[PDB]
Structure formats: C-alpha cells, structure tokens
Design an enzyme around this catalytic site. Structure first.
Site, short mmCIF file in Angstrom:
data_model
loop_
_atom_site.label_atom_id
_atom_site.label_comp_id
_atom_site.label_asym_id
_atom_site.label_seq_id
_atom_site.Cartn_x
_atom_site.Cartn_y
_atom_site.Cartn_z
N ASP A 1 1.11 -1.03 -0.07
CA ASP A 1 -0.18 0.15 -0.11
C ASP A 1 0.82 1.31 -0.05
OD1 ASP A 1 -2.60 -1.61 -0.07
OD2 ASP A 1 -2.40 -1.57 1.97
N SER A 2 1.94 1.11 0.02
CA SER A 2 3.25 2.49 -0.35
C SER A 2 2.62 2.84 -1.82
CB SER A 2 4.07 2.41 0.11
OG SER A 2 5.04 1.36 -0.43
#
Ligand SMILES: [Mg+2]
Ligand SMILES: [Zn+2]
Ligand SMILES: [Zn+2]
Ligand SMILES: [Zn+2]
Ligand SMILES: [Zn+2]
Lengths: 169, 45, 51, 66, 1161, 51, 57
Positions: free
Chosen positions: E786-787
């Site tokens: 999710d970065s």
RNA sequence: UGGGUGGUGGC
C-alpha cells in the site's frame, strides 16, 4: 494490632494538611492564581472549624451546634471522597464537581494507571512509517532531524576519544 | 509612519499610535499594513 | 506586479524545471522475434495486440 | 484555476494553447477535435488541457480590493 | 411522450437543485423560527402578576395593587455594531468575521405594564439573537452577486450556519426519540417484568417533554403467578395498579373497562389473561377512593385532607398525565380510549400476535434542527427573564418607585446565555453544565468544499456510548434514500452518525388544525359515539399521536387527501400515510420527519398511464424553458402531482421498482450487462413509486465516488470518510477571509470519471485533486502493502503542490480603569521574561510588516502589559509555531468588541508533497508516498508516457475493489476521445463498450501497453496496465506528526513530562508496553524507563517510624524525625515523584505507608 | 512589488516552468561554480518585468 | 499484543523524514502503511543497551 | 509558559 492499627485511630480528631505541592496554584492568566480544589476545600473546612468554635463560646440554640458540626463532618467527607452514595456531590464555582483525593487515585487516568504503573516518558520519538526492502531484517530508517533531537550518552573511555571529539566538532 | 492601507478607499495613511483607527472617508475601521521596503526572495521551484 | 528574476543554469537532476525535452518514444523488435516480451492473452496472441 | 505550462506527465509546453483552445471552442468545435488540431496526440497533453477548470475569472470578479 | 431516459431524470435533478440549493434544512426552519416561534414563545405566558394587597401594617387598606406586565410584539432588524464610539452602523459578515464579532441583531420588545385598580419601558433591547448566514433575516438573502463581490460573499457559498464570537458554528440535527407513539418493547429476562408499553409525551405547540407513562407487565415467562399489570406515573414514587388508575381517570366498573379495552368477546385467550387483572383490582371499588389511594404514594402531602389530596390527584390526572393529548378535561373518553388502545396493544404483543417493535425503524424517530433547538433554549432563558423582572419588581414596589423598566433589563442574560451555549454547545444554562446533552454545535470545518457540504447536513445520535449494542448501530433497512449507506466515520462514531442523503428534506412543522378540518370535512366520526361492539371494523385515525375518531372506508378518503397533496390543499410536506392492516390511518405533521421524493407511478388502472411514469416530456421541455407556457420551478412540480413525498412511515406501505426501464416488463444472455430480478410473483403489480435515480440513495460525500456499485462496502465507507479530507478550494474568497486553517491545492482538475451528480456539489467547478497516471505494477518492492511510487519530475512540474494558510489572534485586556495593554516592541531592560527567540522582526508598532520572511520561534504579536504596581512590563508575546516557516501575507489591525485594539495575522507558506505524505485513491487504496523516482527511471510505454502513481498489485486482489480498475479504464478512454464519461452508477455502462472503444481507437482492449525497464529497456515480460485516474490529497502530512524529545517541559503537579504535541510532550510508555517488557523480562530496562527518563525523585526516611517526615537541610546538613527525636536512623531512597505523591496523599487521608528497608517476617 | 490575485511563490513556480532559448548555453557556466558572489552579468539573464 | 510487539533493531540514517522498515517485520507488529505510528524509545545507559541487544533483538 | 472541560479526525 496495637502499635500499628489501634481502633481509636479510626476516628479523626486531627485531620492533616498536605504541603502545597499537592495543591499548587495555577496561573489563571499569568497574574492571578486560581487555586487547586484542595486549597478551596481546606479553606471551607477551616471556615466551618471557626464556625464550630464560635458556638461553644456564646449563646447556642442547640441545633445550630448540630448543623455546624454535621457540616464539619460533611466537609471532612468531601475532602477524601465526592462520590458517596445517596447524597448530592460537593460542587465548584463552575457547576463542576470537586477533585477529591479519591478522584486523584481511582480511574484510568489516576496516579497509578495514569502515572505510576504506566506514564509518559522522554527519549521517545514518533512518526509515520514506510516500507523499504533494500534493507536487512534488523534495520530501521531514521530521519535526520529525529537523530538530531534524540541522543545517547556514550561514556568517554580510553577507546573512543577521537570520534567523540569530532562529534563535538 | 507605516502605510496603513485603508480597507475601503485604499488611502495610504500613517497613524501616530494615537489616532482612532478608521477610514477618513467613510468611517470604515479596517486597516492593513502595506508591503515592506525590503525585497522578498523566492527560489521558483 | 513588478518582478525581478535571475536566470541561472541547472539540469534536470536538480529539479525538472530544467527539463530540456518532453516525451520520448522507444521501441525495438515490434514483432517480438526475440520473445523478450510475453503477451497476456484471452483467446489468441496474434489478433488482439495491434501493430 | 489557470492553465499550467508543461504537461504533468510528459513536459510539452502547453500554456499558450489555452486562448487558442477557447477560440476554437467558440466556433462550435468538439473538444477532442480541437485538441486534434492543436497537435496534442499523447493523452498527457490531453489531460493537461481537457480537465482543466477555471477559477481565476472568479478571482477577478472581486471588484477592486484596493 | 417517449421513454423517460436517464438524462430526463437529470433534468428533474437540475430543477430540484436549482430551487433549493443544498441547505434548505437550516434556512427554512430558521425562517420558521424568526417568523413565528419567538412571537408565540413570548405570547405563551404573556403576563406576570404581583400583589401587595392588605395589612401593610395597614388601616385595613385592602387594595389589590396587582402589578401586571403584558409582553407584546417583537421587533426585528439587521445586525448592528454599536461602537465604543457609540455610533451604530450596518455590520456585515465580512466585518463580522474580521473583528471577532457576533453577527447578532437587536431583538426588541415592548412591554404592556398595567395595574388592576380593583380595591377589596419601550423597545428594550431584551437580547441579541445571533443571525444565521444567508437567511431571510440576514441582509444577504437578496442583493446582486456583483455587489456580493463588492460585499465579499462568494456565490458558490450557501451559508446555513451561525457566527459566534467571530467564528463559525453549525447545528447538527440532534436526533430525539419520537413522541406520542404507542410502542411496545420486550424486557430482558433476569427480571420479573417482561412486556412493556411505553410513551414519551410532549406538547403539540412548543414540542417539549412533559410526561412519560410506563407500563410494566408483572410476570416473567412462567414466573410471577398473577399475570396482571401495574402502571407507573409521573410525580409518583412507586408502581400503581392498572385497573386502579383506570378507575382514577373516571371509569369505575369492570364492564366499562372491558368495553373500552376489549374488542373481541371471542378472544378468550387474551380475555383469559385479562381476568386476574380485574380480580386483583377488586379492593378499590370507585373513583374517589382510588384518587385517595394515589394520593398516598404520589406527592399529595401528608395531613393535607381528603378534599385537597384528591384535588392534587385530580391535578396529576388533569395536567401531568397524558398532557400532549390535551390539558383540559372533559375528554376522559379520549384519555381512556387512548389507554385502552395501550392495553389492547400490550396484550397483543404479550401473546405474540406480532413481533416486538424495534428501536430503529426510522419512521419511528424524528429530528431536531435549529428551529426546535432555539425554541427550547429561548424558552429556557425566557423563563429566566420572567423571574428576573419578577425579582426587580418586588424590590421597586416595597419602596414604591415608578420604574422605567430600562434599568430593569440587564440584557446580558439571554445574549450571554446563547453566546456561551453556541460557543461550546454544552447545551443549557451554564449552571446546568453536566446532565446536559454535550456537543450540540460544532466548529464548522473549512478544509475543503465537499467536506463542508456534508458537515452542514450531519445528524448525531444520543444513546451516549453507554451500551455497546449493535442493534442501534445497524444499517437498518428503512435507510433507503434517507441516510448514507457509505458515509459514517471509522470507530467510536460508527453506526450512530447519519449524514442526510442527497434526497433529504426536513419537514417544518405545520398547522395540524386544518388537517383536522380535512378529517371532519368528510364525515369522520367523533370519539364519543364510539362503541367497538357497535363498530368493530371502523378505522381509528391518528394525528401526530392523538386518536381523534373512527371511519369505515379509508380508501376514498386517502384518494381525496392524497390527491389534495397532489394538488396543494395541504402543506405538500405533510405525510398522509395509509395502513389497511390495523384498520388505522395516520397523519403525521410532526417536526423533523425525514422525507424523500419519488416519481409518482400512476398506480391506478383508470387510464393508460398505469404502470408508466406520470412525468411527461412536456414537463421536461417546460423545465428547459424555465417557464410554463402561460415561473415554473421545482415547486410547481411538487404542486403538480408528479412527485410525492414520503418519510419513513410511508416507506412501510409502498412498492418500488428501481429504474424506469423496469416499469414495463422487458425482453438474450449477454455477459456484459446486469441482471435485474424478474418480479414474476405478482402477475399484475400495482407499482406506486419508482426511484428518480438510484445514485440518489447516497450521501453527499458518497456521490463523489466513481462507480460505488463495484466495491467491497467498507472501502465505500472509507472513501466517503476520506473525501472530507481533500486539499482543494474551500470558498473562492480566501483573499479576504481570515481562518486558522485554510489550504489551497494548486492545480485542481475535474475528474474524468465525473458523475452526473458532481454538478450539484459544484466539484467540477471546484475540485480538490488531480488526474495523475496510474500504473498498477510491482516495480522494485516499494509498493509492497500500500505504499507507492511518485515521479519527482512530475512534482517539479507542480503536482499537488499545496498552499498553506493560518490565522492567529490577540487582543487588548484592561487591568484597570487607567491600566490597559499595549502591543509594543519591548526592550531588553524594562520588560520581564523575554521569549528566548529574537525580537528583530517586530516593527515600531508591535506587528511585523508583510513581505518579511519568518521562521518559527520568533515573535509576531508582542503584547506588553506593564505590571500593575524599574523592570515593570510583562513580555507576553504571541509567537509563531515551533514547526513552521513562511512569508507573511495580510496583517489585519483593528478595534475589538471592547473598544481597545485587536489583531489578526494570516501567515502563509507552501508545502512540497514529499516522502511520507498520505494520498488516497477514490476507492480507499491508500497509503503514503513510499519513494520518489526521477523522470527517466520510471517505466514508460511505447509513446513516451511515464506514470506518476503506482499502486500495488498486492493492494488489489484481497481488497476486491474492481471499481478502481473500471475507473482507470474509463479514464483512459475518455481522455483519448476527449470528454468526460458518465460514471454515475447503475447504468447500462458495461465494461464492453469501454473495451471496444479503446480497441477501435487504436489500442489494446484490456488496458495494457508493453512497458519497459527504465534501467535497461529490456521489455517488461508481462504487459503493464496503465492509465490516468482521479487522485486527491488527505490532510495529514509527515511534517505534522514527526516529534522527538530529549527533555523539557514537566508539569508542576506531578513532574512527569507533559502531554500533547503542541508543548513538545512525551509519549505514553503505557501499560501493555510494560507487559511486553515483563514478557521479555529484562526489567533493568524497565528500571531505566520508570525511574530515569522521568520524575527521578529523592526522599528521606527515618528508620524507626519508617516515614518520610525527615526535614532536610543540606548546607547545614542536619535532620530531625520530629515525632521520634530520631537523628541517626536516617536513609534516603530513589522513588518516582508520583509514588511520593501517593504517599503524601495517603498520609493526608490517614493511612500510614511505612517503608522499612529490611525484611522482618 | 506584487499586489495580485495570485500569491508569490506561485508565480515564481510558474515562471520556473517557462521555456527559454538556450541555444548558446554551453558558453554559459554553471551557477554554483561561476566566479561571482551573488548574481552579476557573467552568469545571469536578469529579467525585470513590470506590467 | 504479544511479546514480539517490542523489538530491538539497529540504526540506519536516511533523509526524507519517515521510518523505514524491512517488510518481513510487517507481520509481527501488524503494521500496514496507510499511516501507522510506531514509537522509538532509546536506551540511556550501557546496561539497557545490552539488555535489548541480547534479548529483544 | 497555564489549567480544566468539550468536540472532531488518524491507526
Ligand atoms: Mg491499518
Ligand atoms: Zn476608505
Ligand atoms: Zn502532456
Ligand atoms: Zn521516626
Ligand atoms: Zn559572474
């Protein structure tokens, strides 16, 4: 037990005064000191004390005695507890209840769970994180400013003088 | 000494730390300071 | 609006306001004769990826 | 707000092509066809002008600040 | 006519949202307040009476000097700022907001003071009611957008909210329980009481709680042998039997109580459960002895004899029980027949001929907006005014002075009350601070535009938080189009907080009396001719909580009345609602019903419109002309008979199809479209309603989302509760406004996945983000969970670069009549406690000139007070924050409410979107900027396009948000064909049309292009999916949550380091951290943590009495345990200062902790 | 001097995006190694504008 | 929540102010990257340094 | 370099 708990000591003739670190005055707006509620309550106790000693030194209609004595007992009751069942609370000059000694000890944010068993401390730091697979397993990235703020006391020994002098420099 | 810009009539009027602070033309009491004599800088990125 | 600018000489590495140019196409082996690429395909590889 | 200069993705300078774009819109063109005429062929310099919505007219609707 | 298409419904929505705008619910009910409510709250209790009649040590001077004041008309105007100069002028909301003012008007009132001579003082400003923005009784309802730029009001503003002490406050529609409805709840088992029939009373006028009659069925399930019931009343102390309070209300015999209650002499089961109730109530046989009996428990006073005891019981049964029905007598049939319906009902439910009632069936609740809230708080401080005048009257009649009344109104009363009670919202008189519904009114939020658009609509729920129960937190299925199935915050609020939907309207409050006339206008029969054995089948009819009569045929009547709301003889927002099941038929007119509109399907087989929509295309052409062919807005639609309103109670009795292609039963097997159900149960339906549009079920922060109908619904809720934290454009006048938070996003693009609904939040004309390039491909592990990746050159071109604004404040105080304050540049000599910053940036007049670069930790507003009676001034400077940098904008300087000076400063800087700054999809796929790559190092497709934002493959397959892919694809197509594709949900827009168009404009069908390494150009083996998408910017950054701390600020009280970021506090190394330290066991680390980086503190102990009484002088180096004369047995310790605090607290409570330093046994 | 409807670093940003002619640029040195303390006419192109 | 939820590490100094991790340690702390906060206590003695370096690593 | 209440948001 006689030298520790002698049951004529469970009746207070002499109720102590703590030193004012436990009720220190707060700068309301930097000239006037709003007092802590212990100071307000010990003032109320001493006022009812003098209004006790006023009755036995003059004409006393015998339940004027009773009410001022029961008021003394009330003030000593709310000094240690403002949560007693059945009776209305002791109230402040805002419409709020009074901070007793019992309210300074129970609850999540009392002195123990909020200050002794767990508390706030220093040499911490805190941020938001990011992944970085170009790393080992025992490594954590440090932003530079957080490295500037926090520190560690390394002892000046005989095997680390040069670098530490450089870190001064 | 400061150009206190009027809020209504744009009049540059200085006040001597004594004047009641209004518009001299309509009573509009809002002023603002004007920009400095210095030169501002920016790096345009 | 009275403005005074300086103009100095930087490259795209400092910042991309010194971009010289805009957009660069690039391709080699348009018919995949090396099989360097591998198509994803529902039905059949030849029909759906346009030339 | 007001048109940017380059594209965001590629970097072809587009800011000049705002006024021409409105003038092409005045004749009844369609927006894709207008971008077609201006030579905007990657979609990078198509989203940098197609999406863009205009506020600085509203800022000049303030009858004079000074 | 033809097919009503989709865009015909968007014609309908354009007419609605050009009539009302948005915030009808504030404005129209606040208009109801200012037009009628204060006139009737004054004329509620218009007169006071004093009398000082006789034996004034008199000459028997028996004189009714009755002092009689009668309150009259109110006077209403613009707000007015009376200066300290004394001059009055037209205040304006700009001049309000700049000057910490209170946009407050004169509320005047004349007073008719009269005197009884039966022997045997002008327009006072009585208070300042603050005026809402954009009201009728604000001066900006009218007057010319041109001049509104001359008056600094944005046209895309909408108002709705109030202004107090400067800042903006709002009214949450607080949500109270419904009144005067005949409920049944069942009670929990560890108790002898199982079934309950409850009510909450409130007067028809006024809408104020008085009584709460409760019923408790004695009897658990086969426990409590006599299965009879008692009542509980208001102003009693104890439960009273049912038949006794019946005989108390004036019906004594057993036969008439069973005639009032029972409707079936064959219902022998319920009749069987009946018999012990009478057999228990035998011992009290007629009326006045039951009156005497209730006199014994319920506050009829002791020794107050039978006639006045029974008087008082007749008062709790005249007033103070069933008060909302009536407060006059004579209608014991109305009272008892109401209660006979109650006994009827509770015995229906105790035999389970029904479900229990449920808490959240949303027709069974109401709402309170600004109207009813100002009604309540105005009522309160108006009573307080009553007794204030009364107090002054009994002082200036003793000395008998002709009082002018103008020194008899200290009108800081109601102005001070309303000002505090919207300042913090602790709703009530301040001397009712607790036991009060806290947090009524809120800081309005101006972070971005849509955030405010939701936040002006928000409702809140007072269950408190006591009760973790998941029944009131359910999305209970009355919610169709009334609240938002997406939006609710994460966490503590969830299940409570209900955002009024994009088809919400708030029903005002209406004269019920003509509705009564409509009832008796057709032969409704009265309540006194009622015999249920004569008429068992008549229909019993409610008006807001009073059963008023009976009738046989509701069908002709609901035809007539429903068509009179389809015409307009009624208020067209009164819900006339039929049931057929109960032989009952209700009409609510109540305040705070949440209604909604539907397309009136011609539900009637009388003509060919049956099944079809009544809305013609001629009406559509009329809306596109703007007029009717000899004004025609949404109001004429409402009064045309094309759209009828329903609230949650008529939601019970309807039949809906979703889209107007489903009204005609349609014509396959195509694998693109969606599958509506057949509805082949009823061969011949009578649809009465069809939805205008389904994406009108959403909330305001929910219609923004591109295709909400392709996701996992927690991500819908997340996107709605993140859409409020966008950076963008909040109102268009950020030049003149001074607010403590403001942020402009630079380059705001309307999204290519626009909706059709974003026209009506103006978001395509004020957006709060951009279109950047999505490329969902694991690249170098930087998007693992999710970065994301962001191309730095695109930021250098200006991507999401952020303006940052902030307004400060200070003012002058007055410490004496000749002693005031002065903002000046303080010296290094005459002034005390200079701040450890510098002072150089200050000017001659104490306020820094704009244009000057400013850092943190240096002054802007140096407020110097000379100490009241060298070194006699106090440096009390107001500095810029310890984190910020900037260059200063617009330094306001003016005069306060007080007459002294006043300042406000609007500093600004600009923040680069850098590593760690949170971003967000439009489907929740959120995260931080993981890493920044320059331009060449991106992957790049065949033409040269690089991307800017790279969400993770592994972010997708479990989160199941396939709408995100659909948005990226539709985005790329609408970019290349160059227009904004309709992504409003629930259309026939499949994926197939988008696929074919992308292919037939010269591309791959399913998105992919063959992208490359930037470090080799060796082709990426799999083809990469790749396009634009609309992005936004959430309000957090990393520069606001980084913090570290060596030492510093400790509290005086406990000497443990302080709490909060703003004072550079320290972190709470909490309980469960100590738990895991114990689990590892290395307790020496724990002795570091709770001794050494905290309140390390050193005390002493006398070794004999074990206490810490030992007085410590050190440079004289002497000690004395003065209770012991101990001078040698002395040790010191190392304990936490809070542990010492424990010890001093305990010894001040007389417990004696004694610390002996050796084991004893 | 600025008094616009636009803020300042805003306009400096947009000016940084502006395309100049640099055909002759390699006989102009880099800023950070040109032999002046702050700007002179060896390594600058000073634009002063006031519309 | 369990006895790994405090773990020792080593220091790597980076600009661009956020905390960096390995991603194999994401499972024990249960952290994702939608904005978590993770703290950083520091020893102030030699003793506690060796305590961490031999047990809580 | 205040307290003390109260609100909304982050995991
Ligand atoms: Mg998380
Ligand atoms: Zn002026
Ligand atoms: Zn482009
Ligand atoms: Zn001793
Ligand atoms: Zn030079």
């Amino acid at each position: 037990n006689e030298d520790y708990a002698r049951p004529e000591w469970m009746i207070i003739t002499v109720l102590p005064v703590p030193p004012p670190q436990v009720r220190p005055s707060i700068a309301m707006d930097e000239t006037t000191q709003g007092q802590d509620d212990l100071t307000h309550k010990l003032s109320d106790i001493l006022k009812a004390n003098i209004n006790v000693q006023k009755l036995e030194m003059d004409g006393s209609p015998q339940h004027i005695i009773n009410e001022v004595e029961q008021l003394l007992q009330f003030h000593v009751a709310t000094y240690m507890d403002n949560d007693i069942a059945g009776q209305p609370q002791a109230l402040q000059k805002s419409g709020r209840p009074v901070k007793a000694i019992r309210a300074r000890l129970k609850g999540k944010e009392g002195r123990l769970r909020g200050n002794l068993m767990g508390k706030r401390v220093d040499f911490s730091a805190r941020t938001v994180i990011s992944g970085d697979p170009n790393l080992e397993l025992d490594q954590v990235g440090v932003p530079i400013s957080i490295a500037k703020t926090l520190s560690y006391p390394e002892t000046v020994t005989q095997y680390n003088i040069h670098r530490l002098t450089e870190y001064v420099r | 000494g400061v150009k206190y810009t009027c809020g209504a009539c744009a009049h540059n009027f200085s006040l001597n730390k004594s004047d009641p602070v209004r518009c001299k033309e309509c009573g509009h009491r809002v002023i603002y300071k004007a920009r400095t004599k210095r030169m501002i800088q920016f790096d345009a990125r | 609006l009275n403005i005074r600018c300086i103009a100095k000489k930087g490259i795209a590495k400092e910042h991309a306001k010194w971009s010289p140019c805009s957009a660069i196409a690039f391709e080699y082996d348009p018919h995949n004769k090396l099989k360097h690429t591998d198509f994803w395909f529902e039905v059949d590889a030849k029909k759906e990826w346009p030339d | 707000m007001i048109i940017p200069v380059r594209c965001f993705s590629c970097g072809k300078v587009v800011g000049d092509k705002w006024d021409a774009y409105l003038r092409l819109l005045e004749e009844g063109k369609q927006e894709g066809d207008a971008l077609d005429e201006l030579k905007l062929k990657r979609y990078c310099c198509r989203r940098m002008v197609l999406t863009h919505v205009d506020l600085i007219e509203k800022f000049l609707r303030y009858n004079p600040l000074e | 006519d033809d097919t009503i298409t989709t865009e015909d419904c968007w014609t309908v929505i354009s007419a609605f949202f050009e009539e009302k705008g948005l915030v009808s619910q504030q404005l129209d009910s606040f208009d109801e307040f200012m037009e009628t409510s204060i006139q009737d709250l004054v004329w509620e209790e218009p007169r006071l009476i004093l009398d000082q009649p006789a034996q004034h040590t008199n000459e028997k001077d028996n004189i009714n000097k009755r002092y009689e004041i009668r309150f009259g008309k109110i006077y209403l105007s613009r707000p007015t700022m009376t200066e300290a100069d004394g001059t009055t002028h037209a205040m304006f909301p700009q001049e309000a907001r700049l000057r910490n003012l209170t946009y407050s008007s004169p509320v005047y009132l004349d007073m008719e003071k009269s005197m009884f001579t039966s022997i045997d003082g002008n327009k006072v400003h009585i208070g300042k009611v603050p005026i809402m923005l954009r009201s009728k009784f604000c001066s900006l309802r009218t007057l010319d957008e041109v001049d509104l730029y001359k008056m600094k009001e944005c046209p895309y503003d909408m108002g709705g909210y109030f202004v107090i002490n400067g800042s903006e406050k709002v009214l949450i529609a607080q949500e109270r329980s419904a009144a005067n409805i005949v409920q049944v709840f069942k009670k929990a088992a560890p108790s002898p009481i199982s079934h309950v029939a409850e009510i909450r009373s409130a007067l028809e006028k006024g809408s104020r709680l008085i009584s709460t009659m409760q019923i408790k069925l004695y009897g658990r399930e086969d426990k409590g042998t006599g299965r009879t019931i008692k009542a509980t009343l208001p102003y009693v102390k104890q439960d009273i039997p049912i038949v006794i309070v019946f005989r108390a209300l004036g019906v004594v015999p057993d036969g008439e109580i069973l005639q009032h209650i029972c409707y079936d002499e064959n219902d022998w089961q319920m009749l069987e459960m009946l018999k012990p109730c009478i057999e228990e109530g035998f011992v009290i046989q007629d009326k006045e002895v039951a009156l005497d009996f209730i006199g014994r428990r319920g506050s009829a006073a002791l020794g107050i004899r039978r006639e006045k005891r029974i008087q008082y019981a007749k008062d709790i049964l005249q007033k103070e029980l069933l008060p909302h029905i009536t407060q006059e007598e004579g209608f014991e049939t109305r009272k008892t027949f109401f209660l006979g319906y109650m006994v009827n009902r509770l015995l229906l439910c105790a035999l389970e001929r029904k479900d229990q009632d449920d808490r959240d069936h949303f027709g069974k609740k109401r709402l309170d907006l600004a109207g009813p809230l100002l009604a309540n708080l105005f009522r309160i401080l108006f009573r307080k005014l009553t007794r204030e005048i009364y107090r002054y009257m009994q002082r200036c009649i003793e000395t008998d002075r002709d009082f002018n009344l103008n020194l008899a109104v200290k009108s800081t009363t109601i102005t001070s009350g309303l000002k505090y009670s919207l300042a913090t919202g602790n709703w009530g008189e301040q001397k009712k601070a607790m036991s009060s519904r806290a947090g009524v009114s809120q800081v309005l939020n101006r972070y971005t535009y849509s955030s405010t658009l939701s936040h002006l609509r928000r409702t809140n729920t007072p269950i408190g938080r006591d009760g973790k129960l998941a029944k009131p937190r359910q999305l209970h299925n009355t919610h169709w189009g009334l609240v938002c199935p997406a939006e609710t915050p994460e966490g503590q609020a969830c299940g409570l907080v209900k955002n009024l939907s994009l088809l919400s309207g708030i029903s005002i409050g209406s004269p019920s009396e003509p509705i009564i006339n409509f009832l008796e206008e057709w032969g409704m029969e009265p309540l006194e001719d009622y015999d249920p054995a004569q008429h068992t089948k008549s229909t019993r009819i409610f008006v807001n909580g009073v059963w008023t009569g009976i009738h046989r045929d509701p069908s002709m009547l609901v035809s007539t009345m429903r068509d009179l709301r389809r015409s307009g003889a009624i208020s067209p927002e009164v819900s006339i609602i039929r049931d057929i099941r109960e032989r009952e038929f209700k009409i609510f007119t109540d305040v705070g019903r949440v209604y909604r509109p539907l397309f009136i399907v011609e539900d009637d087989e009388s003509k060919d419109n049956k099944g079809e929509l009544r809305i013609t295309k001629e009406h559509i052409r009329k809306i596109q002309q703007g007029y009717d062919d000899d004004v025609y807005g949404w109001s004429s639609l409402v009064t045309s008979g094309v759209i009828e309103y329903v609230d949650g109670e008529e939601e019970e009795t309807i039949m809906i199809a979703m889209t107007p292609e489903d009204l005609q039963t349609r014509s396959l097997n195509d694998t693109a479209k969606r599958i509506k159900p057949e509805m082949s149960t009823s061969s011949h339906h009578t649809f009465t309603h069809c939805e205008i549009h389904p994406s009108m079920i959403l909330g305001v922060a929910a219609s923004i989302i591109p295709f909400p109908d392709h996701n996992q619904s927690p991500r819908n809720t997340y996107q709605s509760a993140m859409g409020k934290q966008a950076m963008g454009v909040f109102l268009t006048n950020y030049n003149v406004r001074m607010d403590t938070m403001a942020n402009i996003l630079y380059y705001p693009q309307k999204p290519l996945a626009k909706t059709q609904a974003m026209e009506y939040l103006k978001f395509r004309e004020l957006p709060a983000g951009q279109n950047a390039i999505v490329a969902i491909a694991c690249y170098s592990g930087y998007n693992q969970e999710d970065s994301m990746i962001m191309n730095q050159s695109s930021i250098d071109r200006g991507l999401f670069r952020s303006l940052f604004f902030r307004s400060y404040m200070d003012q002058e105080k007055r410490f004496g009549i000749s002693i005031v304050e002065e903002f000046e540049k303080p010296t290094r000599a005459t002034t005390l406690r200079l701040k450890h910053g510098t002072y150089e940036k200050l000017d001659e007049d104490g306020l820094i000139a704009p244009g000057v670069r400013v850092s943190g930790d240096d002054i802007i507003i140096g407020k110097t007070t000379p100490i009241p009676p060298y070194h006699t001034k106090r440096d009390a400077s107001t500095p810029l924050r310890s984190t910020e940098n900037g260059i200063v904008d617009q330094v306001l300087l003016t005069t306060n409410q007080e007459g002294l000076k006043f300042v406000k400063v609007r500093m600004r800087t600009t923040k680069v979107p850098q590593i760690g700054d949170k971003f967000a999809s439009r489907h929740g796929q959120k995260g931080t900027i993981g890493v920044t790559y320059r331009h060449e190092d991106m992957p790049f497709s065949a033409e040269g396009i690089v991307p800017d934002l790279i969400i993770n493959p592994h972010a997708i397959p479990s989160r199941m948000t396939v709408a995100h892919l659909i948005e990226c694809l539709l985005s790329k197509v609408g970019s290349i064909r160059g227009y904004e594709g309709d992504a409003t949900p629930f259309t026939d827009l499949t994926v197939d049309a988008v696929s074919n168009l992308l292919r037939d404009n010269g591309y791959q069908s399913r998105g992919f292009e063959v992208m490359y390494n930037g470090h080799t150009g060796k082709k990426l083996m799999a083809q990469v999916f790749f396009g634009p998408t609309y992005y936004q910017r959430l309000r957090h950054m990393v520069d606001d949550k980084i913090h570290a701390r060596a030492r510093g600020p400790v509290q005086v009280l406990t000497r443990q380091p302080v709490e909060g970021r703003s004072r550079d506090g320290g972190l709470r190394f909490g309980e469960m951290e100590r738990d895991c330290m114990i689990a590892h066991g290395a307790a020496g680390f724990l002795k570091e943590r709770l001794m050494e980086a905290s309140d390390a503190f050193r005390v002493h102990v006398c070794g004999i009495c074990g206490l810490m009484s030992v007085i410590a002088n050190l440079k004289k180096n002497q000690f004395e345990c003065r209770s012991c004369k101990n001078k040698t047995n002395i040790y010191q310790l190392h304990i936490p200062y809070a542990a010492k605090l424990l010890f001093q607290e305990l010894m001040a409570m007389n417990i004696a902790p004694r610390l002996y330093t050796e084991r004893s046994g | 001097m600025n008094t616009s409807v636009l803020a300042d670093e805003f306009i400096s940003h947009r000016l940084g995006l502006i395309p100049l002619v640099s055909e002759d640029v390699e006989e102009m040195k880099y800023s950070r190694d040109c032999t002046c303390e702050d700007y002179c006419d060896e390594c600058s192109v000073v634009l002063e504008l006031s519309a | 929540l369990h006895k790994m939820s405090m773990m020792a590490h080593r220091v790597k100094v980076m600009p661009y102010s956020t905390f960096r991790l390995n991603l194999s340690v994401t499972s024990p702390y249960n952290a994702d990257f939608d904005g978590d906060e993770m703290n950083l206590h520091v020893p102030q003695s030699e003793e506690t340094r060796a305590e961490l370096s031999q047990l809580c690593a």
